[PDB]
Amino acid sequence: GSHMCDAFVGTWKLVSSENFDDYMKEVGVGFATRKVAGMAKPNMIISVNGDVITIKSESTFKNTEISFILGQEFDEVTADDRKVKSTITLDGGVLVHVQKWDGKSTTIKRKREDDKLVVECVMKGVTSTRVYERA
Numbered sequence: 001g002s003h004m005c006d007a008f009v010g011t012w013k014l015v016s017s018e019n020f021d022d023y024m025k026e027v028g029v030g031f032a033t034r035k036v037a038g039m040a041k042p043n044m045i046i047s048v049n050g051d052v053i054t055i056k057s058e059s060t061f062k063n064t065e066i067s068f069i070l071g072q073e074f075d076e077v078t079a080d081d082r083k084v085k086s087t088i089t090l091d092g093g094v095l096v097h098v099q100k101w102d103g104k105s106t107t108i109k110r111k112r113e114d115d116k117l118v119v120e121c122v123m124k125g126v127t128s129t130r131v132y133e134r135a
């Protein structure tokens with residue numbers, strides 16, 4: 001086993017969000033997509049198979065999935081339709097996901113806190129915090 005498995009693997013459901021509309025504005029998401037996506041209560045399904053980590057997002061708005069190896073950059077087409085270059089690392093027990101596109105950057109951190117998975121999303125000075133619980 002591993003730290004990664006013990007901490008993050010499982011099925012997680014959104015239970016609270018703060019500042020996500022403002023984070024989405026900063027990223028460039030348009031009005032209609034922000035309103036519909038902001039209603040969603042996604043599940044985040046995290047699994048590990050050898051070196052490969054998969055993070056699946058399921059919702060009423062969009063379903064997507066990424067698979068990756070830590071430290072190894074990959075192309076991601078995000079659900080808000082950005083074509084980004086992503087790298088995900090494990091730094092001090094936190095999964096740190098950086099997305100680069102059009103000379104911009106955003107960082108998404110996933111951390112365990114108590115029985116929750118806390119996701120912090122930062123674009124310029126805007127931070128959104130999304131809290132997920134085990135399904």
Ligand SMILES: CCc1nc(C(C)(C)C)c(-c2nnn[nH]2)c(-c2ccccc2)c1-c1ccccc1
Nearest residue numbers: 027029033037040042057059061079080108121
């Ligand atoms: C900005 C892009 C974005 N980023 C996230 C984070 C990784 C950063 C948190 C998520 C999200 N994924 N799981 N939970 N939340 C979603 C989202 C996923 C499904 C439903 C609603 C929101 C969106 C997003 C996707 C499509 C349109 C607009 C936003």
